């Protein structure tokens, strides 16, 4: 199989800048590669075919280049609508293969996360459950690490995380982390902590509490 490689999962840029997304084929496929753009909850949209041709109706700021194995998609004078995910594809020989895609995100100034932790509710405890929740809102870059520590020990089992897309209003990122235990287990420990490491701080941000 011909492997298509897009080394950068994410790329940061600004409106008016020029970006170049790379894509490499494990074998020489001449100019039989295409580029597709895709936005949240939508289907792929054809932008480039035959390595450098633009489909009818595509902005001229979009340009494709390369031949053989090294290809690239360049977007000069970037626009807000251009912010999306880009996939390259070789349709030279079966099985047809796509790259892993590259997400284009708006660049913005660094922002530390606002962290807040919450204990299990009475309602959930009555049902025999216990979830501890941690919110880490409006931070940037998107890279961040969250850890849970029960009475000093890190706990990785029973944790579920959810991340939001880059906010269209302030270009920041938010995350939610929930640790779920059984009521019995919850009432078996005392110290619960949410620890986050982020570019904006040398030391981790710590939010915790003790049962009762």
């Amino acid at each position: 199989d011909i492997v298509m490689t897009q080394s950068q999962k994410f790329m940061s840029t600004s409106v008016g800048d020029r970006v170049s997304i790379s894509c490499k084929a494990s074998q020489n496929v001449g100019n039989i590669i295409a580029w597709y753009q895709q936005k949240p909850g939508q289907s792929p949209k054809a932008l480039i075919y035959l390595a450098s041709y633009r489909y009818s109706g595509v902005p001229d700021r979009f340009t494709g280049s390369g031949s053989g194995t090294d290809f690239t998609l360049t977007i000069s004078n970037v626009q807000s609508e251009d912010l999306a995910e880009y996939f390259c594809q070789q349709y030279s020989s079966f099985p047809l293969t796509f790259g892993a895609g590259t997400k284009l995100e708006l660049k913005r100034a660094d922002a530390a996360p606002t962290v807040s932790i919450f204990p299990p509710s009475s309602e959930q405890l009555t049902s025999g459950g216990a979830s501890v929740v941690c919110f880490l809102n409006n931070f940037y870059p998107k890279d961040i690490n969250v850890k849970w520590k029960i009475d000093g020990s890190e706990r990785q089992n029973g944790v579920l995380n959810s991340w939001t897309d880059q906010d269209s209003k302030d270009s920041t990122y938010s995350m939610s982390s929930t640790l779920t235990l059984t009521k019995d287990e919850y009432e078996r420990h005392n110290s619960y902590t949410c620890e986050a490491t982020h570019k904006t701080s040398t030391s981790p941000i710590v939010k915790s509490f003790n049962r009762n």
Partner: protein
């Protein structure tokens, strides 16, 4: 003028078998190959196979051989893809697309979402999230709502019936052990809560449920 009309979402339990459709219009159906692609956050876009509606010939990606079967109905310009022995691994979005020998996939359907779960419709449990001991350091405070144990999607969530639209973050739902759990936080001024009541309104149409959970100080 070309248009690919895919069938709607599907919900089935493991071992089952679904048959998605892709109605074509605006061009000569038998002149182009119809391709199918699978999309998933973990595997990305994956080519499944292609069918030439002209004679019915097909090509399959080894990886989906035995999993997917492609056919067409020439008279109704419709293409089909059936997936059997479904498992949670087959849960993804499936697109049909027109294949052009030299221009690649010039057209794509909207896609059909396939969710494979052994779960049955289930209303969510709405849990209030109040700050530890009702405290807050800044001139603002953050409350939240934990919507867990529901199926299927989607869920509608608002704060104070929508009056509080600013400063809210409703996180994407996560599927775990057959059920979904979503999260939502809201940030307001210290002078707002507990002073004034903050309520989490959660609706789940699939089960016809509406729940209003007020965040109480403890």
């Amino acid at each position: 003028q070309a248009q690919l009309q895919e069938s709607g979402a599907e919900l089935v339990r493991p071992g089952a078998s679904v048959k998605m459709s892709c109605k074509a219009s605006g061009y000569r159906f038998t002149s182009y190959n119809m391709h199918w692609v699978k999309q998933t956050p973990r595997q990305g876009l994956e080519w499944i196979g292609a069918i030439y509606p002209g004679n019915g010939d097909t090509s399959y990606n080894q990886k989906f051989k035995g999993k997917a079967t492609l056919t067409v109905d020439k008279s109704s310009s419709t293409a089909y893809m059936q997936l059997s022995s479904l498992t949670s691994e087959d849960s993804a979005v499936y697109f049909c697309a027109r294949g052009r020998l030299s221009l690649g996939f010039d057209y794509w359907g909207q896609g059909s979402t396939l969710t494979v779960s052994s779960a049955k419709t289930t209303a969510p449990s709405v849990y209030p999230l109040a700050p530890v001991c009702g405290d807050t350091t800044g001139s603002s405070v953050t409350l939240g709502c934990l919507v867990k144990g529901y199926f299927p999607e989607p869920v509608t969530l608002t704060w104070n019936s929508g009056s509080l639209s600013s400063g809210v973050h409703t996180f994407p739902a996560v599927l775990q052990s057959d059920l979904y759990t979503l999260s939502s936080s809201v940030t307001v001024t210290s002078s707002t809560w507990p002073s004034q009541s903050i309520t989490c309104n959660v609706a789940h149409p699939a089960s016809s449920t509406k729940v209003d959970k007020k965040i109480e100080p403890r």
